[PDB]
Amino acid sequence: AIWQGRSLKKPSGGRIILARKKRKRELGREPANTKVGEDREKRKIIRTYGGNRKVRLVEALYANVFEGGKGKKVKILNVVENPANRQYARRNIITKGAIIETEIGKAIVTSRPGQDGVVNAVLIK
Amino acid sequence: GDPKRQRKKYETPSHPWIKERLDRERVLKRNYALKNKKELWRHETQLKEFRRRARRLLAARGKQAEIERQQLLQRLYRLGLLPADAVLDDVLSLTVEDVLERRLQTIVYRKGLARTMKQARQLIVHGHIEVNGQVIRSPGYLVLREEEDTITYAKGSPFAKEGHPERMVIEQAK
Amino acid sequence: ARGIVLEKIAVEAKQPNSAMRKAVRVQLIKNGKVVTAFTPGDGAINHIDEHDEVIIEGIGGPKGGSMGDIPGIRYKVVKVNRVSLKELVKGRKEKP
Amino acid sequence: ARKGPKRHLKRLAAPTSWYIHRKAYKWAVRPSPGPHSMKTSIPLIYIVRDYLGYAKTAREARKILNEGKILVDGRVRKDYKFPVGIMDVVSIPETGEHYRVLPNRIGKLILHPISEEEAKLKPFRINNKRMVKGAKVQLNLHDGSNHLVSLAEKDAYKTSYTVIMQVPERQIVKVLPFEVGAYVFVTQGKNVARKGKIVEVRQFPMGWPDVVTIEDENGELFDTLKEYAFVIGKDKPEISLP
RNA sequence: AUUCCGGUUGAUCCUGCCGGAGGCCACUGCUAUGGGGGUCCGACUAAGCCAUGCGAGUCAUGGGGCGCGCGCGCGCACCGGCGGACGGCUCAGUAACACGUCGGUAACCUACCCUCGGGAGGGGGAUAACCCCGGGAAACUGGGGCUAAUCCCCCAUAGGCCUGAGGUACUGGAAGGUCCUCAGGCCGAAAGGGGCAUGCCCGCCCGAGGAUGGGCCGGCGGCCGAUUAGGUAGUUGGUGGGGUAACGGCCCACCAAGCCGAAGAUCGGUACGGGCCAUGAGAGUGGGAGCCCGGAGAUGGACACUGAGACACGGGUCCAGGCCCUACGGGGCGCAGCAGGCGCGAAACCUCCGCAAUGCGGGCAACCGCGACGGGGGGACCCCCAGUGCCGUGGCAGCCACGGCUUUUCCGGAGUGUAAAAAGCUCCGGGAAUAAGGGCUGGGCAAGGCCGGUGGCAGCCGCCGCGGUAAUACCGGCGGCCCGAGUGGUGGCCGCUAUUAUUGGGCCUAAAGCGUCCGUAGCCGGGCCCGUAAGUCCCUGGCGAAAUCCCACGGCUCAACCGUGGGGCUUGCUGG
RNA sequence: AGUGGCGAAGGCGCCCGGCUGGAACGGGUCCGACGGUGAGGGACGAAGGCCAGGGGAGCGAACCGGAUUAGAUACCCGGGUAG
RNA sequence: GAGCCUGGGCUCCGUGAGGGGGGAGAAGUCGUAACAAGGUAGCCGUAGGGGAACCUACGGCUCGAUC
RNA sequence: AGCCGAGGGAACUCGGCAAAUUGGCCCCGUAACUUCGGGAGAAGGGGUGCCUGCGGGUGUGUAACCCGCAGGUCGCAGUGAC
RNA sequence: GCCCUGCAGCAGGGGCCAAGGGUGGGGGUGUUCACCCAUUAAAGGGGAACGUGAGCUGGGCUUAGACCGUCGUGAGACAGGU
């Protein structure tokens, strides 16, 4: 259970005793480690706080690449140089900021696929 | 916090066995036919509150201050303790005998409707006395200035007939 | 506080007085501790047997302590088997 | 620990703008959400029962309301929790009665009787402005209502002007602007229920609201917030006020 | 009333402590007639354990069937919808952005409600109820057949979200915001239903805003301990990400060594916070159960489903600790809800009546329900008003006899009152009848220098001190003083106390100047001129809920109580 | 030799010489407020005692004796270790 | 992430055979230390001794009387 | 003279005699008492193989000797025997 | 398996015939014995070179080493302890 609510320590280094139980409002969820798929792309739909909706990607195959206003749709090859974690490139995990290899070339991801359910990228010079 | 309880409207003496005060209060109780010490202290507390308000309002600056001043003086006039041309400094000359004179028992005595304070108390408690249009049974009602000329015997009352034996005996004195 | 009696006793008064004040050792039901309590009145010690139930009050003294002639005691008896010891002494009652 | 919204109101915790005995019973009617705020409104049940005296019990008041006899802004209102607020009209045709809801110099709501002709107009203060899809202009008013206008006449409306409207059909009439000689009536604050002419406006930095100076009808000046000034005319009021 | 008195000596003046004398709270001894009003009655020890009954339903104008009476009308369960996350109870835990006040969210969610702008097209399916079989001690539960909807699903269109390139129409103090254009993609609505009628009422979906209720952030304020001195290691920050409704070391990978602290950190102790309450002339000291606002909890601990909203007080799962039924196979419960019972104790009520008033839920409505709420019952809870006789003649020294009067109160009756009763209020009959005690009596301290009994024994005594054969001090009687339906005892707080001293105390000899000096922080600092305006003073704007406190007027006979209005309180914050 | 003097206090007395600290007086000299007190910290501080090494006349705790005394672990007398 | 076991950290109360000093109470036994110059003036600091109050030595003070 | 033994675990015996347990290296953590030097390797806890690569130290060094990191994989067991 | 009883029954006392079978496990002590614990139908007692060292053990006892107490001038000693 990801509680995501508060730290049990002051900046002075002292301890804080929780004076109540954990509330359902404060909880989080497990991360969507979005990988490059093989033949299918998988999505999930989540019901949230106010009856609202979220879309998760689990396996991705296509990306929307952009170069100066006009955009195209292509396939994703290997991931290159995710600067948020060292294991993510080897494991071919896509997050915002990752550099991917496509049919055209190299592109920087500008979207959060764990929140939006889509991979959008800007082409590199 | 704590909520408010209701508090007494009378105060007791600081020491209970002082000869001067004992003698004074004994004389007053005997002369005015008061049941117990508690009544005296009630009237004395009324007077003390008047005096404290006067002391506080005296030489104080403010519209609310002059408002309170006029209200105090008019309330005193209406109760019948001061006249219409009176100044704040005239409150510090009042006594408890004034309040004791302004009550229904003493007034029923002075007006010749009874021969004794005890007889007056009995009449008031049994319901033979009517203020302008109302029977009242509390001997400490503190008649106002606008009702002292409207006190007489109740409509339905043995004492309302000119030829009642006790009424004759009462009139004997006057 | 309530208590159970164990032993009647008599304490010698302080100088320059001379007398024997009758008292009783009492075991408390709250905690099991034993204290000594004075029996006021003439003959009060006759209206008290052992294993009788007893109610205990403070005796009344400077700084919530002991009184003049008998230092060492702090408590006095109020009731014996749920009956007032004053009534017992005066004879206006009979203990069960 | 409360796990959800409230559905009850105690009398000692009711707002000061009401005329209500607080130590008589324990419960009060909790107003339902609606046009005006909670501090500036009052339910219809109290207007029908305790103000005008057309009933002694809530059952009778509710029967009266459900029979379709009370109008607000020209519309039948059957909910006994519906809140009535400043500048609203309460009308009863079976008695030809018409009232405008206004505040006192203390901050409490009273009913001022008016005529059947002035009972057809209600002024609305503009609180905000928005662009909506299709390029239309949406004005957000003081009672919480909204009105659409076109892009061509967007400069003829601003965020403190007043618009007079025929209330059941809601057609616009007689826009009144915020200027330096306009007549205003104060709705909230310490100078509530006063009226006068504008003299000066003052702006401030970083979120602090603007202020306005007003001249009384006899020569005395005072100040208040520009959000509490309700324009009602140019040099002469356009409604019957007390 | 801005107060004093007793006690160290053979006698005196001081210092200093003890005690008396006042008020409020809890327990208790003796005693007790009446009415009214109010926010009182298992808080102090066991947030310990619970038998029995009740505390949350409602909709036939959503749907199908079944039974009863002349297609129509009544009644029952089922499907379905809304609600059950409020109201009610307690004070264990918590020294914390928990609380209070001022501000912010341009970093967020919101079913029921309001306004405006728009929509409702085309298809399909299952299954309770019902019929045929049952299983099981129970709790519960299987198979086959048949069926409807405002039940469930699919297609479409609108719409929602992400990214990129442009235009600069809106608000505001200020645009990662709204609007327009183009492009690439993901998700993806709706009950044209029910009723009346020859259009109206109640409803369904989308968008923009508001309202209601919440989430998060900040500045300021608020106990004791040094025989508790160094603490912190995701700890402090940064870059990049994940997750969230949302900002954030909330979490992760990498790069640094930072953060708190003698102006007292950390650790420990005690404790729900405030509005308010008691006391005092005030300065101040102490408390914060009952009414309101807020917080937390539901035997102890942890974890989830459904829903706008819960990690759920009368819903779920596991462990620990207790209990109940059993056909021994298995099953069920935790009153800090109202009554009621056990136990713990010095210490706390009836297993009552009603939805007539105030309110909440459901319903178009009519209305139904509610141990909330209202009404009574028991209780020396608090406050207000009264009573237990009055008059006259004579007598004695307040009371006796004689005669007369009255009926609040008491006994009985008729009306009104009340959801129904009862109390109360008007009236009738009878009749001085029916109703005072508790403490004290040597001096503080008010009232006996009377009788008897006992005889350092017995007993008394806040303190001083009485008692050893003539006792004003013990016990009893007779007298007398204080208060009085109340009066005494024990514990606690304030005052007394200038014995905690800012106002306002002391240090040669009574308690008290470090053995002396140097100096760090801190506190205190010479005169004149110029400037600034942080402190400081005046004026004005926005806030500091209500109740509680003061005054006046008005309504219950007056009053306590309730209502209208004016001031105050909120120890203060903030814009000029 | 003082009823005197110097020193922050403790304390300091034969003469001569050298090195050194502070104060008073006189001053139309210089600087121009550079000051007071001082928690915490520091330095000095009689006698006595302790450590290590030297010395040791007189006096003298402990101790050894003689007297007094009812008793004398004391006062008086003769010696004497530490110091 | 409960619960169980286990190894430590802190701290309040609980209980324990038996020893030391303290305080009251009776006043019992040995002496006569302090109050007069108390019969050796008294008291502070340090050290040694002694049944007990106490003795002695070095330094200090008068809160010491007399000629 | 040696190796293994289910369940129990000193009930054996004067007596745990004999046998068994632990064991190398790195990191965390470490009491009473004390002649302050010690006790102390106190106690107690976690890890360790093979393969594929990445870095540091001295050095001119794709010479030599040492110190760290990540990932993949097998077994009942990685100081696997000694 | 039987007899008497101050044997109602359950159990107890006392005595007769019977040696076929049984009579065990633990704590302190070198112990035998005695004492205690929990079980048990009961947990009898003796003899056989005080049965049994060309069967085991070696705790005691009874050489040569050493310590304490006491006795003795001493060398030393103790049906005393270790």
PDB file of all heavy atoms in Angstrom, chain E residues 96 98-99 220-223 273-274:
ATOM      1  P     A E  96       5.552  18.597  18.590  1.00  0.00           P
ATOM      2  OP1   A E  96       6.844  17.904  18.812  1.00  0.00           O
ATOM      3  OP2   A E  96       5.551  19.947  17.978  1.00  0.00           O
ATOM      4  O5'   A E  96       4.629  17.641  17.712  1.00  0.00           O
ATOM      5  C5'   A E  96       4.825  17.510  16.313  1.00  0.00           C
ATOM      6  C4'   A E  96       3.510  17.453  15.581  1.00  0.00           C
ATOM      7  O4'   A E  96       2.437  17.288  16.542  1.00  0.00           O
ATOM      8  C3'   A E  96       3.138  18.703  14.795  1.00  0.00           C
ATOM      9  O3'   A E  96       3.696  18.705  13.491  1.00  0.00           O
ATOM     10  C2'   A E  96       1.617  18.675  14.802  1.00  0.00           C
ATOM     11  O2'   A E  96       1.116  17.810  13.797  1.00  0.00           O
ATOM     12  C1'   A E  96       1.321  18.063  16.169  1.00  0.00           C
ATOM     13  N9    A E  96       1.101  19.068  17.223  1.00  0.00           N
ATOM     14  C8    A E  96       1.771  20.240  17.452  1.00  0.00           C
ATOM     15  N7    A E  96       1.345  20.899  18.499  1.00  0.00           N
ATOM     16  C5    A E  96       0.333  20.098  19.000  1.00  0.00           C
ATOM     17  C6    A E  96      -0.522  20.233  20.101  1.00  0.00           C
ATOM     18  N6    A E  96      -0.489  21.266  20.937  1.00  0.00           N
ATOM     19  N1    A E  96      -1.422  19.256  20.325  1.00  0.00           N
ATOM     20  C2    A E  96      -1.454  18.218  19.487  1.00  0.00           C
ATOM     21  N3    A E  96      -0.706  17.975  18.418  1.00  0.00           N
ATOM     22  C4    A E  96       0.177  18.967  18.228  1.00  0.00           C
ATOM     23  P     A E  98      -2.019  18.975  11.389  1.00  0.00           P
ATOM     24  OP1   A E  98      -1.087  18.100  12.139  1.00  0.00           O
ATOM     25  OP2   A E  98      -2.434  18.600  10.018  1.00  0.00           O
ATOM     26  O5'   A E  98      -3.337  19.144  12.265  1.00  0.00           O
ATOM     27  C5'   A E  98      -4.193  18.043  12.528  1.00  0.00           C
ATOM     28  C4'   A E  98      -4.748  18.108  13.926  1.00  0.00           C
ATOM     29  O4'   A E  98      -3.659  17.967  14.877  1.00  0.00           O
ATOM     30  C3'   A E  98      -5.413  19.421  14.313  1.00  0.00           C
ATOM     31  O3'   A E  98      -6.757  19.528  13.879  1.00  0.00           O
ATOM     32  C2'   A E  98      -5.243  19.443  15.823  1.00  0.00           C
ATOM     33  O2'   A E  98      -6.178  18.586  16.461  1.00  0.00           O
ATOM     34  C1'   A E  98      -3.852  18.841  15.966  1.00  0.00           C
ATOM     35  N9    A E  98      -2.799  19.869  15.914  1.00  0.00           N
ATOM     36  C8    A E  98      -1.807  19.984  14.979  1.00  0.00           C
ATOM     37  N7    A E  98      -1.004  20.997  15.172  1.00  0.00           N
ATOM     38  C5    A E  98      -1.502  21.589  16.318  1.00  0.00           C
ATOM     39  C6    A E  98      -1.089  22.712  17.046  1.00  0.00           C
ATOM     40  N6    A E  98      -0.042  23.457  16.697  1.00  0.00           N
ATOM     41  N1    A E  98      -1.799  23.039  18.142  1.00  0.00           N
ATOM     42  C2    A E  98      -2.849  22.276  18.468  1.00  0.00           C
ATOM     43  N3    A E  98      -3.336  21.200  17.866  1.00  0.00           N
ATOM     44  C4    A E  98      -2.605  20.905  16.785  1.00  0.00           C
ATOM     45  P     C E  99      -7.264  20.871  13.156  1.00  0.00           P
ATOM     46  OP1   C E  99      -8.624  20.629  12.625  1.00  0.00           O
ATOM     47  OP2   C E  99      -6.197  21.333  12.237  1.00  0.00           O
ATOM     48  O5'   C E  99      -7.378  21.932  14.338  1.00  0.00           O
ATOM     49  C5'   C E  99      -8.187  21.673  15.473  1.00  0.00           C
ATOM     50  C4'   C E  99      -7.953  22.676  16.573  1.00  0.00           C
ATOM     51  O4'   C E  99      -6.570  22.627  17.004  1.00  0.00           O
ATOM     52  C3'   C E  99      -8.175  24.134  16.213  1.00  0.00           C
ATOM     53  O3'   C E  99      -9.543  24.507  16.226  1.00  0.00           O
ATOM     54  C2'   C E  99      -7.335  24.860  17.253  1.00  0.00           C
ATOM     55  O2'   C E  99      -8.011  24.936  18.496  1.00  0.00           O
ATOM     56  C1'   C E  99      -6.146  23.914  17.401  1.00  0.00           C
ATOM     57  N1    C E  99      -4.986  24.314  16.572  1.00  0.00           N
ATOM     58  C2    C E  99      -4.235  25.443  16.913  1.00  0.00           C
ATOM     59  O2    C E  99      -4.567  26.111  17.899  1.00  0.00           O
ATOM     60  N3    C E  99      -3.177  25.784  16.145  1.00  0.00           N
ATOM     61  C4    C E  99      -2.859  25.042  15.089  1.00  0.00           C
ATOM     62  N4    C E  99      -1.811  25.403  14.356  1.00  0.00           N
ATOM     63  C5    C E  99      -3.598  23.886  14.730  1.00  0.00           C
ATOM     64  C6    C E  99      -4.640  23.563  15.491  1.00  0.00           C
ATOM     65  P     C E 220       6.514  33.219  11.548  1.00  0.00           P
ATOM     66  OP1   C E 220       7.773  33.900  11.933  1.00  0.00           O
ATOM     67  OP2   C E 220       6.480  31.739  11.481  1.00  0.00           O
ATOM     68  O5'   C E 220       5.377  33.703  12.553  1.00  0.00           O
ATOM     69  C5'   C E 220       5.255  35.073  12.898  1.00  0.00           C
ATOM     70  C4'   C E 220       3.932  35.381  13.550  1.00  0.00           C
ATOM     71  O4'   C E 220       2.840  34.950  12.699  1.00  0.00           O
ATOM     72  C3'   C E 220       3.652  34.692  14.875  1.00  0.00           C
ATOM     73  O3'   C E 220       4.310  35.296  15.973  1.00  0.00           O
ATOM     74  C2'   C E 220       2.134  34.761  14.957  1.00  0.00           C
ATOM     75  O2'   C E 220       1.697  36.046  15.366  1.00  0.00           O
ATOM     76  C1'   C E 220       1.743  34.549  13.496  1.00  0.00           C
ATOM     77  N1    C E 220       1.434  33.133  13.211  1.00  0.00           N
ATOM     78  C2    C E 220       0.193  32.634  13.602  1.00  0.00           C
ATOM     79  O2    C E 220      -0.599  33.396  14.166  1.00  0.00           O
ATOM     80  N3    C E 220      -0.104  31.344  13.356  1.00  0.00           N
ATOM     81  C4    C E 220       0.787  30.571  12.745  1.00  0.00           C
ATOM     82  N4    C E 220       0.460  29.307  12.518  1.00  0.00           N
ATOM     83  C5    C E 220       2.058  31.051  12.337  1.00  0.00           C
ATOM     84  C6    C E 220       2.339  32.328  12.590  1.00  0.00           C
ATOM     85  P     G E 221       4.956  34.384  17.129  1.00  0.00           P
ATOM     86  OP1   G E 221       5.779  35.262  17.992  1.00  0.00           O
ATOM     87  OP2   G E 221       5.576  33.193  16.502  1.00  0.00           O
ATOM     88  O5'   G E 221       3.705  33.896  17.983  1.00  0.00           O
ATOM     89  C5'   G E 221       2.957  34.816  18.764  1.00  0.00           C
ATOM     90  C4'   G E 221       1.713  34.189  19.334  1.00  0.00           C
ATOM     91  O4'   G E 221       0.898  33.656  18.265  1.00  0.00           O
ATOM     92  C3'   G E 221       1.919  33.009  20.271  1.00  0.00           C
ATOM     93  O3'   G E 221       2.230  33.419  21.593  1.00  0.00           O
ATOM     94  C2'   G E 221       0.594  32.261  20.170  1.00  0.00           C
ATOM     95  O2'   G E 221      -0.376  32.824  21.038  1.00  0.00           O
ATOM     96  C1'   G E 221       0.179  32.533  18.723  1.00  0.00           C
ATOM     97  N9    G E 221       0.409  31.402  17.802  1.00  0.00           N
ATOM     98  C8    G E 221       1.430  31.249  16.899  1.00  0.00           C
ATOM     99  N7    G E 221       1.347  30.153  16.200  1.00  0.00           N
ATOM    100  C5    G E 221       0.188  29.548  16.654  1.00  0.00           C
ATOM    101  C6    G E 221      -0.423  28.329  16.269  1.00  0.00           C
ATOM    102  O6    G E 221      -0.054  27.513  15.420  1.00  0.00           O
ATOM    103  N1    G E 221      -1.586  28.091  16.985  1.00  0.00           N
ATOM    104  C2    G E 221      -2.097  28.915  17.949  1.00  0.00           C
ATOM    105  N2    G E 221      -3.231  28.519  18.535  1.00  0.00           N
ATOM    106  N3    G E 221      -1.539  30.053  18.320  1.00  0.00           N
ATOM    107  C4    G E 221      -0.406  30.307  17.636  1.00  0.00           C
ATOM    108  P     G E 222       3.385  32.687  22.436  1.00  0.00           P
ATOM    109  OP1   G E 222       3.802  33.621  23.507  1.00  0.00           O
ATOM    110  OP2   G E 222       4.398  32.151  21.497  1.00  0.00           O
ATOM    111  O5'   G E 222       2.647  31.456  23.126  1.00  0.00           O
ATOM    112  C5'   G E 222       1.658  31.662  24.123  1.00  0.00           C
ATOM    113  C4'   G E 222       0.585  30.605  24.065  1.00  0.00           C
ATOM    114  O4'   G E 222       0.181  30.408  22.689  1.00  0.00           O
ATOM    115  C3'   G E 222       0.979  29.216  24.545  1.00  0.00           C
ATOM    116  O3'   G E 222       0.887  29.080  25.955  1.00  0.00           O
ATOM    117  C2'   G E 222       0.007  28.308  23.799  1.00  0.00           C
ATOM    118  O2'   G E 222      -1.230  28.205  24.488  1.00  0.00           O
ATOM    119  C1'   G E 222      -0.213  29.071  22.490  1.00  0.00           C
ATOM    120  N9    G E 222       0.532  28.497  21.352  1.00  0.00           N
ATOM    121  C8    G E 222       1.708  28.896  20.760  1.00  0.00           C
ATOM    122  N7    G E 222       2.062  28.141  19.755  1.00  0.00           N
ATOM    123  C5    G E 222       1.057  27.188  19.677  1.00  0.00           C
ATOM    124  C6    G E 222       0.872  26.094  18.794  1.00  0.00           C
ATOM    125  O6    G E 222       1.590  25.723  17.858  1.00  0.00           O
ATOM    126  N1    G E 222      -0.297  25.398  19.091  1.00  0.00           N
ATOM    127  C2    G E 222      -1.165  25.710  20.095  1.00  0.00           C
ATOM    128  N2    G E 222      -2.221  24.908  20.206  1.00  0.00           N
ATOM    129  N3    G E 222      -1.012  26.719  20.926  1.00  0.00           N
ATOM    130  C4    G E 222       0.112  27.403  20.654  1.00  0.00           C
ATOM    131  P     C E 223       2.202  28.888  26.861  1.00  0.00           P
ATOM    132  OP1   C E 223       2.092  29.837  27.996  1.00  0.00           O
ATOM    133  OP2   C E 223       3.402  28.925  25.988  1.00  0.00           O
ATOM    134  O5'   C E 223       2.065  27.414  27.455  1.00  0.00           O
ATOM    135  C5'   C E 223       3.205  26.735  27.963  1.00  0.00           C
ATOM    136  C4'   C E 223       2.860  25.795  29.093  1.00  0.00           C
ATOM    137  O4'   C E 223       2.220  24.605  28.566  1.00  0.00           O
ATOM    138  C3'   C E 223       4.043  25.262  29.886  1.00  0.00           C
ATOM    139  O3'   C E 223       4.495  26.167  30.877  1.00  0.00           O
ATOM    140  C2'   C E 223       3.512  23.952  30.451  1.00  0.00           C
ATOM    141  O2'   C E 223       2.723  24.173  31.610  1.00  0.00           O
ATOM    142  C1'   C E 223       2.599  23.475  29.325  1.00  0.00           C
ATOM    143  N1    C E 223       3.237  22.485  28.423  1.00  0.00           N
ATOM    144  C2    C E 223       3.652  21.225  28.887  1.00  0.00           C
ATOM    145  O2    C E 223       3.523  20.940  30.084  1.00  0.00           O
ATOM    146  N3    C E 223       4.210  20.356  28.012  1.00  0.00           N
ATOM    147  C4    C E 223       4.339  20.691  26.732  1.00  0.00           C
ATOM    148  N4    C E 223       4.889  19.825  25.888  1.00  0.00           N
ATOM    149  C5    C E 223       3.917  21.946  26.237  1.00  0.00           C
ATOM    150  C6    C E 223       3.371  22.798  27.104  1.00  0.00           C
ATOM    151  P     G E 273      -6.776  19.915  26.251  1.00  0.00           P
ATOM    152  OP1   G E 273      -5.666  20.435  27.081  1.00  0.00           O
ATOM    153  OP2   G E 273      -8.123  19.753  26.845  1.00  0.00           O
ATOM    154  O5'   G E 273      -6.912  20.869  24.988  1.00  0.00           O
ATOM    155  C5'   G E 273      -5.763  21.246  24.250  1.00  0.00           C
ATOM    156  C4'   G E 273      -6.110  22.078  23.044  1.00  0.00           C
ATOM    157  O4'   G E 273      -6.897  21.301  22.102  1.00  0.00           O
ATOM    158  C3'   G E 273      -6.965  23.307  23.294  1.00  0.00           C
ATOM    159  O3'   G E 273      -6.248  24.398  23.839  1.00  0.00           O
ATOM    160  C2'   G E 273      -7.544  23.571  21.916  1.00  0.00           C
ATOM    161  O2'   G E 273      -6.579  24.167  21.066  1.00  0.00           O
ATOM    162  C1'   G E 273      -7.812  22.148  21.436  1.00  0.00           C
ATOM    163  N9    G E 273      -9.183  21.710  21.760  1.00  0.00           N
ATOM    164  C8    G E 273      -9.553  20.833  22.742  1.00  0.00           C
ATOM    165  N7    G E 273     -10.837  20.636  22.809  1.00  0.00           N
ATOM    166  C5    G E 273     -11.349  21.436  21.803  1.00  0.00           C
ATOM    167  C6    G E 273     -12.687  21.642  21.394  1.00  0.00           C
ATOM    168  O6    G E 273     -13.711  21.135  21.855  1.00  0.00           O
ATOM    169  N1    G E 273     -12.770  22.534  20.338  1.00  0.00           N
ATOM    170  C2    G E 273     -11.701  23.154  19.748  1.00  0.00           C
ATOM    171  N2    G E 273     -11.968  23.987  18.739  1.00  0.00           N
ATOM    172  N3    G E 273     -10.447  22.974  20.120  1.00  0.00           N
ATOM    173  C4    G E 273     -10.344  22.110  21.148  1.00  0.00           C
ATOM    174  P     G E 274      -6.899  25.268  25.022  1.00  0.00           P
ATOM    175  OP1   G E 274      -5.856  26.202  25.507  1.00  0.00           O
ATOM    176  OP2   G E 274      -7.565  24.353  25.980  1.00  0.00           O
ATOM    177  O5'   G E 274      -8.027  26.124  24.294  1.00  0.00           O
ATOM    178  C5'   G E 274      -7.666  27.192  23.435  1.00  0.00           C
ATOM    179  C4'   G E 274      -8.766  27.566  22.477  1.00  0.00           C
ATOM    180  O4'   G E 274      -9.405  26.383  21.930  1.00  0.00           O
ATOM    181  C3'   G E 274      -9.925  28.356  23.049  1.00  0.00           C
ATOM    182  O3'   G E 274      -9.619  29.717  23.287  1.00  0.00           O
ATOM    183  C2'   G E 274     -11.002  28.138  21.998  1.00  0.00           C
ATOM    184  O2'   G E 274     -10.773  28.954  20.860  1.00  0.00           O
ATOM    185  C1'   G E 274     -10.753  26.677  21.621  1.00  0.00           C
ATOM    186  N9    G E 274     -11.640  25.762  22.363  1.00  0.00           N
ATOM    187  C8    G E 274     -11.308  24.891  23.367  1.00  0.00           C
ATOM    188  N7    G E 274     -12.327  24.221  23.825  1.00  0.00           N
ATOM    189  C5    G E 274     -13.401  24.678  23.078  1.00  0.00           C
ATOM    190  C6    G E 274     -14.770  24.323  23.118  1.00  0.00           C
ATOM    191  O6    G E 274     -15.326  23.501  23.848  1.00  0.00           O
ATOM    192  N1    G E 274     -15.514  25.029  22.184  1.00  0.00           N
ATOM    193  C2    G E 274     -15.010  25.961  21.321  1.00  0.00           C
ATOM    194  N2    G E 274     -15.880  26.551  20.495  1.00  0.00           N
ATOM    195  N3    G E 274     -13.737  26.304  21.274  1.00  0.00           N
ATOM    196  C4    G E 274     -12.994  25.628  22.173  1.00  0.00           C
TER     197        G E 274
END
